Design a protein around this ligand. Structure first.
Ligand SMILES: COc1ccc(-c2cc(C)cc3c2O[C@H](C2CCOCC2)C=C3O)cc1OC
Ligand SMILES: [Zn+2]
Ligand SMILES: [Zn+2]
Length: 328
């Protein structure tokens, strides 16, 4: 009835679960390639989600393992480790002082659950690849947010496997609201939606209202969901805000995933996608443009929303940007 030493070492790493820069890859190793399961379990227990939503523990574990099993181990970036990272990052962002007492338990559950499932069954190629190959997935979703629609459908469908229905004790009301929020959040992870999301986030920053003491004020679904969508989108694009040792591991993986798509594209005379050509790439330059044009504007805007809780995150982002730029 006592942990093995490896379990104890895993446990000690998991004590960083509330902090930016968790050793997520070490957790993946220590857990036997169960970072999503262990980190979700730890988070649910930390936030008392099992008791609040009456989720039987074995059902939660069975669903998590099942969810995790449907991420592809042969996918360098969009895998269970990325899922785990986004979950934990969303978890940290939920706990930002500027958002204290803003969100309900159901909204908290929605953001975390959405994070966990948001990339499930990712084949490691882009929507455009799937569209251009006339893939069954593309035809299923009429070429529109193909992967993101698929991630949702899988994440929900898996609740129907043996002893996986973690929402079995929620009321119809709770389930309908949870489901709508989850769907809105994951569809907002489609990068084609980025400019619009960010514009709306800015608009809210300009017209934001604080509150008794201090803390954002969100008094309609549109505003609450938009913040959750951006929060998870921020989590999704959080790699460059992490300590360089982490960021670089992510960059290696996404680049490996991209070049592999480029290889499959070249193999069949398809035009090679941006950043996917292993022969004509500039990893450093791509990362800088990525930060300058996407990541930094997002996080700058987010940091304004929760001023000044995200200052350290922004500073890390700029340091990493300078580092990459420093390297041609
Ligand atoms: C217009 O949509 C996009 C805008 C920027 C990017 C983009 C551009 C650069 C230079 C680098 C990156 C990038 O997105 C990828 C990630 C791929 C999975 O979704 C989140 C972003 C990782 C980069 O390091 C990708 C987009 O589509 C996935
Ligand atoms: Zn995705
Ligand atoms: Zn993702």
């Amino acid at each position: 009835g006592v942990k093995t030493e490896q379990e104890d070492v895993l446990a000690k790493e998991l004590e960083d679960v509330n902090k930016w820069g968790l050793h997520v890859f070490r957790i993946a190793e220590l857990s036997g390639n169960r970072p999503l399961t262990v980190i979700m379990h730890t988070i649910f227990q930390e936030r008392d989600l099992l008791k609040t939503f009456k989720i039987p523990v074995d059902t939660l574990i069975t669903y998590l393992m099942t969810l995790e099993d449907h991420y592809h181990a042969d996918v360098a970036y969009h895998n269970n480790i990325h899922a785990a990272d986004v979950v934990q990052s969303t978890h940290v962002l939920l706990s930002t002082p500027a958002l204290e007492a803003v969100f309900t338990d159901l909204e908290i559950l929605a953001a975390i659950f959405a994070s966990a499932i948001h990339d499930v069954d990712h084949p490691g190629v882009s929507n455009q690849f799937l569209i251009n190959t006339n893939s069954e997935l593309a035809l299923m979703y009429n070429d529109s947010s193909v992967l993101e629609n698929h991630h949702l459908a899988v994440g929900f469908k898996l609740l129907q496997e043996e002893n996986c229905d973690i929402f079995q004790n929620l009321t119809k009301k709770q389930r309908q609201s949870l489901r709508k929020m989850v769907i809105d959040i994951v569809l907002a992870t489609d990068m084609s939606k980025h400019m619009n999301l960010l514009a709306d986030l800015k608009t809210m920053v300009e017209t934001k209202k604080v509150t008794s003491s201090g803390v954002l004020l969100l008094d309609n679904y549109s505003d609450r969901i938009q913040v959750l969508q951006n929060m998870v989108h921020c989590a999704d694009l959080s790699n460059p805000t992490k300590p360089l040792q982490l960021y670089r591991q992510w960059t290696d993986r996404i680049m490996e995933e991209f070049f592999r798509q480029g290889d499959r594209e070249r193999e069949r005379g398809m035009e090679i996608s941006p950043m996917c050509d292993k022969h004509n790439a500039s990893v450093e330059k791509s990362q800088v443009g990525f930060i300058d044009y996407i990541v930094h504007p997002l996080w700058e805007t987010w940091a304004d929303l929760v001023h000044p809780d995200a200052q350290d995150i922004l500073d890390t982002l700029e340091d990493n940007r300078e580092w990459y730029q420093s390297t041609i």
